[PDB]
Design a protein around this ligand. Structure first.
Ligand code: SAM
Ligand code: NA
Length: 376
DNA sequence: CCACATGCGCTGAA
DNA sequence: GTTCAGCGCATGTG
């Protein structure tokens, strides 16, 4: 009766998709398997392996000779020199493990019908809004489209991914992007998929974070007919509220910010349940100038900048949300954070960067809970 | 025009 | 090349 769910995570990061599936697997009678993944960012790969591996023992290794397209900052490729610096280190063993055990193909431009796994149950992905335009698609989405085009011609219909799931930022549905987004949906139709777009806020899925994200869930149209799957109305879901205080970790050795030079005001709560107050003459950057009340929800955690530096008011003073608390804020577990910390390879700021790039795990749990698979 | 809200950001000096 | 402190406006609603 157990159903093996083969998942392929494009732009996998630390694997919020895989985590959500593992979290619900027992309740669905599923066994989750790594079909493959695509992630080039060294710190994300290391962290993914730390979080998701079982019985991996890191050791000094030569980097596999075809691991050539990777990135230390997530944006730009590492040089020949930088590859040399990873070669013959413990870090190399993480990258080798991701390749061998998780079938990480690293770079989407290197994925094609000759290495894209057949019979995928769930394919996850994303793309920046620029990719909708010429510079017709471009960039990462063009590669995803190329891959779907390629496998459409070489695979049987039944070998194509059963479900696709895109995550993206809210601005995907802006005036400038919405029509071109709709043409991507038309293209998915041409590839044989029926889709539904959801705009979901983490705060409605048992989280203390305001975070609005766009999801496009697609089902292969013959599999829709076979299963009798119907899309659920997830935008109407409103679970009980959670407050920032519910995730905070007690410590006697936090660093508190000296805000004595800055004038401030009372807290005010907005319609989004964010409770905040401004610091006057602090910076000229509006999003940096707020302190958040722990009895409401907080702002969207970003990878960098002002919203990666979330100031909260506590009895003990004003401080930033810690890297551990940021993992919790994205609905990863304390043990996931400890595994990443224990690598001794990822800085505190890099741990927040990877958390800020992820997806709140319980949103994905709710989406994946709606999927239907046949007993055959 | 206004008030208000809100952000998986970006980058150049060291 | 890295790192992060310093820095503002795009894109809305009402
Ligand atoms: C917003 S994040 C995704 C985080 C992920 N959803 C998670 O569960 O943590 C986007 C990711 O795409 C990755 N990426 C960017 N360009 C890539 C490429 N050419 N190949 C593979 N991954 C890429 C980045 O390194 C980054 O980790
Ligand atoms: Na080396």
């Amino acid at each position: 009766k157990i159903k093996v769910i083969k998942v392929f995570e494009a732009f996998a990061g630390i694997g919020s998709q895989f985590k959500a599936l593992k979290n619900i697997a027992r309740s669905k009678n599923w066994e989750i398997q790594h079909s493959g993944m695509v992630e080039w960012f060294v710190d994300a790969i290391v962290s993914y392996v730390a979080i998701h591996s079982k019985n991996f023992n890191p050791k000094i290794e030569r980097l596999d000779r075809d691991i050539l397209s990777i990135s230390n900052d997530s944006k730009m490729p590492i040089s020949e020199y930088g590859i040399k610096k990873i070669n013959n280190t413990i870090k190399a063993s993480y990258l080798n493990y991701a390749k061998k055990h998780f079938n990480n193909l690293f770079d989407i431009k290197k994925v094609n019908k000759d290495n894209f796994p057949k019979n995928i149950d769930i394919f996850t992905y994303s793309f920046p809004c620029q990719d909708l335009s010429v510079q017709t698609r471009s960039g990462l989405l063009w590669e995803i489209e190329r891959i779907l085009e390629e496998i459409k011609n070489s695979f049987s219909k039944e070998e194509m991914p059963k479900y696709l799931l895109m995550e993206n930022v809210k601005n995907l549905l802006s005036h400038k992007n919405k029509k071109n987004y709709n043409t991507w949906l038309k293209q998915l139709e041409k590839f044989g998929y029926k889709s539904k777009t959801y705009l979901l806020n983490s705060k409605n899925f048992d989280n203390c974070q305001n975070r609005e994200r766009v999801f496009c869930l697609s089902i292969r149209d013959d599999y829709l007919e076979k299963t009798g799957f119907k899309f659920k109305e997830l935008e109407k879901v409103k679970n009980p509220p959670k407050k920032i205080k519910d995730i905070l970790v007690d410590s006697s050795n936090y660093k508190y910010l000296n805000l004595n030079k800055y004038e401030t005001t009372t807290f005010r709560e907005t319609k989004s349940n964010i409770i905040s107050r401004p610091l006057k003459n602090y910076t000229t950057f509006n999003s940096e100038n707020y302190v958040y009340n722990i009895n409401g929800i907080g702002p969207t955690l970003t990878a960098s900048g002002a919203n990666s530096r979330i100031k909260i008011e506590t009895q003990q003073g004003v401080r930033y949300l810690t890297p551990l608390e940021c993992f919790k804020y994205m609905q990863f577990d304390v043990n996931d954070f400890k595994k990443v910390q224990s690598t001794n390879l990822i800085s505190e700021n890099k741990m927040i960067y990877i958390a800020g790039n992820s997806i709140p795990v319980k949103i994905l749990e709710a989406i994946f809970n709606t999927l239907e698979f046949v007993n055959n």
